[PDB]
Design a protein around this ligand. Sequence first.
Ligand SMILES: OC[C@H]1O[C@@H](S[C@@H]2O[C@H](CO)[C@H](O)[C@H](n3cc(-c4cccc(F)c4)nn3)[C@H]2O)[C@H](O)[C@@H](O)[C@H]1O
Lengths: 133, 135
Amino acid sequence: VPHKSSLPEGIRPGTVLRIRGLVPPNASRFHVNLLCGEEQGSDAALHFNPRLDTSEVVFNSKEQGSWGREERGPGVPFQRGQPFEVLIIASDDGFKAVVGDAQYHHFRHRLPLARVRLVEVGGDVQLDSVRIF
Amino acid sequence: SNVPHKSSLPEGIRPGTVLRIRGLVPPNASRFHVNLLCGEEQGSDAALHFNPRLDTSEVVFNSKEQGSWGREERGPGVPFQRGQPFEVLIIASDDGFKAVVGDAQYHHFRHRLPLARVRLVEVGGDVQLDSVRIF
Ligand SMILES: OC[C@H]1O[C@@H](S[C@@H]2O[C@H](CO)[C@H](O)[C@H](n3cc(-c4cccc(F)c4)nn3)[C@H]2O)[C@H](O)[C@@H](O)[C@H]1O
């Protein structure tokens, strides 16, 4: 079952999501979604999707049940059996995705920041904690 | 053998910027500081002066503008100890700086100077820095 956390103050520039976890001995992939509602198929302002089995990291958004243009990151800053700490940082012009001690990708806003209400973490990952700062 | 830090921020900092500071407060420590400065000159204006004072058990927040300090704000107690490592997040938002210490929200410092003026991060005083990263 995917982990879900509400954003009680919504998200604004300055909102920081810290996700600590572990990638299982062989995970295929896992994802972090920033969702605009609790209903099934709700829009995703951000879909962050490390894929171990294809060695990619896909970024996308979704509206009206339709994915958008995929953006991909440089390499795979995740490995099976190793713990991670991801920061998702909301700025005025996009989301900064930080893995470890390095800026990994910058994803420009497609949907209004204000519509975001939910963080979802699913797929093959062992979730240690989701913290919102 | 204190280990300080100076980093330039040529493009400045925008709402949604994270300064992560990790280090050790050494056994004899009196105090240390994290400054967000507007220039490289001596006594530059400061959007943020963050000042854990181990010797007085206070954490002071202030700004400096046109050469004059503002009114100090104080956080709730001192989440630092001599002989112990720490992690501080200084998070810039639309309305101010959020200080996070040891994974807990600690203080919120409303902007006094425009964020666009910040040009430099300096960390010094009685601290042995592990790392300073800006995201
Ligand atoms: O956009 C995010 C979503 O991606 C899909 S998977 C997706 O399916 C697409 C079908 O048109 C393409 O096959 C796409 N694609 C494109 C490429 C591609 C194309 C050109 C160059 C190069 F390097 C790669 N490879 N795969 C693939 O990623 C997931 O099911 C969903 O959960 C979510 O992550």
